[PDB]
Design a protein around this ligand. Sequence first.
Ligand SMILES: [Zn+2]
Lengths: 32, 140, 51
Amino acid sequence: GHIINKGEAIGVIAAQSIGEPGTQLTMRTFHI
Amino acid sequence: LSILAIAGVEPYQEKPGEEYMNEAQLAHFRRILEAWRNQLRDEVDRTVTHMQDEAANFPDPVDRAAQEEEFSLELRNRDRERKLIKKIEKTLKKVEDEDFGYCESCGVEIGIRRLEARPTADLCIDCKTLAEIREKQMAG
Amino acid sequence: GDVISDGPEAPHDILRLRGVHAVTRYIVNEVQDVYRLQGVKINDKHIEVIV
Ligand SMILES: [Zn+2]
């Protein structure tokens, strides 16, 4: 819970977080 | 028809010497159109709350395809309702512009009782049917 | 940076005409709109590193 540490490779862990739930999105083309 | 039910509107009834399109009639279709529009707005809005709960919970690999199947039916329909709302809005412009009740191809007038079933009707049966025939030939 | 016509606009514009902080805010909300429409929580932090 503390602040991000020096050296943590935040670029990767950022990317992962976005790409994991991608399975739950509709890959057709929803139009609201 | 649950459409006529949604509004507190009852099928109209053209009286003996009633002029064609009058104030009372456009007030009649406005209530139905807004209520129909208000009902459609609630369907697109509700649906999403269920839609947001399923996407948050992760299904088991086995039930991803079964869960997804119900999602696709909803999605397709919604875009049609968006089209329907846009058609209603387009029809709502015809009332304000005082050009409601007549065929768009030929000047012929569209039936009063015909408009109560589907207030968004744009053509008379002759032009509309002919259009559907051209369709099957120009498409396939 | 005003709307001179309507319809969606290209992110290439927003950065140029409205600002680095403007385009970044366009993306984060319009991507989260798709995820948040689906009930998925992804902290803006991440989307920002991509930006
Ligand atoms: Zn006609």
